[PDB]
Amino acid sequence: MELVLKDAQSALTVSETTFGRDFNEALVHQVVVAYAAGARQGTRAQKTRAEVTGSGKKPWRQKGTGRARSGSIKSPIWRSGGVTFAARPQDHSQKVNKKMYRGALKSILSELVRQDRLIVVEKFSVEAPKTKLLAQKLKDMALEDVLIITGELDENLFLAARNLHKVDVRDATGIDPVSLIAFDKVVMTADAVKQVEE
Amino acid sequence: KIRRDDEVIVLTGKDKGKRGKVKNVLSSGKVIVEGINLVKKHQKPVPALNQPGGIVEKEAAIQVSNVAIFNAATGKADRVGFRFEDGKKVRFFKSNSET
Amino acid sequence: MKAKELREKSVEELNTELLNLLREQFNLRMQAASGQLQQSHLLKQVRRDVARVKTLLNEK
RNA sequence: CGUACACGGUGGAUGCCCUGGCAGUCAAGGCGAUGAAGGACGUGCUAAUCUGCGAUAAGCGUCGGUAAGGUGAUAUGAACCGUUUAACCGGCGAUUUCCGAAUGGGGAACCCCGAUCAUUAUCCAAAUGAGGCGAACCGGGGGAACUGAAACAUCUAAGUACCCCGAGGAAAAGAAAUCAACCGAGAUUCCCCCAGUAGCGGCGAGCGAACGGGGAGCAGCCCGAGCCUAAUCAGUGUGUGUGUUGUGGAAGCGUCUGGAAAGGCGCGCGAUACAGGGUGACAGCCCCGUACACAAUGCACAUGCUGUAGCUCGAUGAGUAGGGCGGGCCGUGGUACCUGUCUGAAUAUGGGGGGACCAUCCUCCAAGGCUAAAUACUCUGACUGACCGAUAGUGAACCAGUA
């Protein structure tokens, strides 16, 4: 259909855009919890170039273990080494995929074209220097409660929004599901929508 | 911050009104003001609280929350004593806002 | 005595001082004698004084 | 005397808390013959432990910081120190017993000297070196077995476990007698891929590359003579940035509940400052602190500069190439590499290589040498954690590696 963009005055209408991809509310809830989990530590195992010197290391008995830098790894015997059991790649994270992670990235982009969601803002948004101006454009927008949700834009990181509640600025190029939905929710700009198309 | 070199003015305890110089600051957060003391058994002006006991922790134990050093605000407290060799601290002391 | 005083003293003055202080510390040994007149202050200072003069003697 | 309950006890679970652990990340990284690490014994007015020092003994001196209080953990008694500004936190210097590599000799810390090997050598130890330590990384040698093959002698586990020697903060390799999709690529490692392909194998089980391509990082150069000189060598001056650590400082209303609000309700404020802690109960505006800025330390590597100094001609290294005998090792197959015994060439109008041998193309030239860069732990400092919570978590949150 047609996604009504908004001006700085949060005008009723501007241009139009949209994303086509069967949005799945089955594709906007955990993923980033997995991001929230997986992004924080995870002892892989073999992933490391650690090697063995064999005997003759230093005048002393030093078992030829999967050593590296000055401490052993990989070997289940020493910490940070690979787990000796079965079914879990990293630490306490959710095993899984490259496609669903992306499928969620596509599906999420579609979530934007939903009534009870965000709204597209004109490019001029990136101009707003002060933060207070944003709060107003968010008030008249009737989405001030979205501060509990999140925010986004295009070109460069919005210094005026970064301050705002739970705001983790991001650019249309590099946006992760987490950004597209700091909790299956978000908000973007005109140019951003165009850039994200790719 | 609070310094033993600063004169304080009680405001809540039964010692409300008394003026005096701090005698020492403890890591616990209790301050002893010179003047705020108790009367021991053999009538000895030694700081402490009140209840029967044996070996004991001196000091009347005052809370910084109810004391009154400098405190820019509409209060009943008045003047308070305060280093100087710093210079920069003199400027702050000269400002009705800092110290 | 302060470092300033020892430096002003002559080579001989520092020798007569050390010998005199050594004399002090010894009469101070009355600690074991359980004397009352004793005082921990000077007792601990004599060792430093004889040390100061000794160091300055080396500085010379 | 049986059962349930009640009061009290025993016991210590449970709930809550935790000055501890576990895990990850960033930074930083060597110590010693001017005699270290470690240990012993001492040292505080009283002190038994721990810590700090060491007979100038939980301390002395200087500069800077800091700040008016302080005399380590212990908040005791006595006493004392500080404004001739201490306590406390940071550079440099002085002192620095004995043993210990110790090294005169002997010795379970006690008594008398450069011991031993070696180089130079005025052959006098006279001038020097080695002899130890250090968590595990790199290199060079020696080299199993349990086990798998559901037995076992190849094979497999292993080139692992273990033994010996040695370096650095990093090591090894390396400019091609190469590759061999070509009128082509073109130093060497490493990552991905090529491949689980070619190849090996009672071809049984199993074993297992490389060329190339895509990347990271890029640098190429030295030995007989002629000539001459801006590479090198010696010395001088001597940082920026960055990284780590430390440092400067003000401010609190109304109603209700309460012993006290950091509560509930009402009103208001700051924010290049939407970390944390403290304060009589969940305080961003009560105090510290956080932006901000400053200071100290390390970095010190480099750059600049003084005197040195190009370039040219010819050749290019034999018990080797290669062959035979006997072994080791390898994915190496008649086609890997190396050791030992014997034999033994030719030379660029030559020789080697392109996975079989020998005569004819293409490529490249050994038997001499050097060479920056591309990562890897966690002792140490700091940070983080949908980790655990004191029969959990490190054996150790309590004297623990103690009793």
Side-chain angles (χ1 to χ4, degrees), chain C residues 12-56:
Chain C
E12 60 175 58
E13 298 180 59
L14 297 177
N15 296 179
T16 180
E17 273 289 60
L18 187 290
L19 181 60
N20 183 299
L21 295 178
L22 202 176
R23 161 174 183 179
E24 202 68 60
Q25 180 185 182
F26 182 91
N27 62 58
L28 298 181
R29 304 265 70 174
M30 290 190 261
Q31 305 305 299
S34 300
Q36 304 70 59
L37 302 66
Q38 67 187 187
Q39 175 64 184
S40 180
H41 185 296
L42 48 295
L43 303 175
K44 184 178 181 179
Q45 280 295 300
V46 177
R47 56 170 60 180
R48 281 60 172 63
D49 296 302
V50 300
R52 299 171 180 175
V53 59
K54 201 66 178 182
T55 60
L56 280 61

Side-chain angles (χ1 to χ4, degrees), chain A residues 87-122:
Chain A
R88 85 98 76 57
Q90 311 81 191
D91 58 323
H92 53 181
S93 179
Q94 294 320 74
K95 306 175 56 183
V96 75
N97 195 294
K98 295 66 183 63
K99 289 69 185 302
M100 298 291 251
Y101 129 63
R102 286 174 293 132
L105 188 290
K106 287 72 175 62
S107 61
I108 195 296
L109 271 44
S110 180
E111 180 185 298
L112 289 61
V113 309
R114 184 69 62 179
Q115 297 63 60
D116 303 300
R117 300 296 180 181
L118 57 164
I119 187 65
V120 186
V121 182
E122 192 64 298

Side-chain angles (χ1 to χ4, degrees), chain B residues 7-89:
Chain B
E7 299 180 299
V8 188
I9 309 299
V10 186
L11 299 175
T12 63
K14 59 181 180 61
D15 300 299
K16 180 180 181 180
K18 295 299 180 179
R19 305 177 299 181
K21 168 192 173 184
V22 183
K23 179 64 74 298
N24 180 58
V25 58
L26 290 299
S27 300
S28 61
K30 301 181 299 180
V31 298
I32 183 286
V33 182
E34 181 178 61
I36 308 301
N37 306 300
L38 179 84
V39 182
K40 298 181 63 180
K41 297 299 180 181
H42 46 301
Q43 303 181 302
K44 275 194 175 182
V46 181
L49 296 81
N50 48 300
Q51 164 183 56
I55 182 173
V56 120
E57 285 289 301
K58 305 180 64 178
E59 175 179 300
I62 303 178
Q63 302 163 52
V64 183
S65 60
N66 60 296
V67 296
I69 309 179
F70 180 61
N71 256 52
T74 58
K76 185 174 297 300
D78 294 300
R79 184 176 62 180
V80 177
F82 300 114
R83 184 176 179 60
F84 178 106
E85 292 295 63
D86 182 59
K88 300 290 78 61
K89 184 177 182 179

Side-chain angles (χ1 to χ4, degrees), chain A residues 19-55:
Chain A
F19 190 71
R21 188 70 177 186
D22 172 60
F23 168 57
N24 306 298
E25 187 158 61
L27 267 299
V28 288
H29 276 75
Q30 159 184 167
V31 168
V32 184
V33 319
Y35 267 122
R40 295 194 178 185
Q41 307 305 174
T43 173
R44 300 177 180 296
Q46 178 181 59
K47 296 307 301 178
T48 173
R49 72 194 71 186
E51 292 296 61
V52 180
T53 48
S55 58

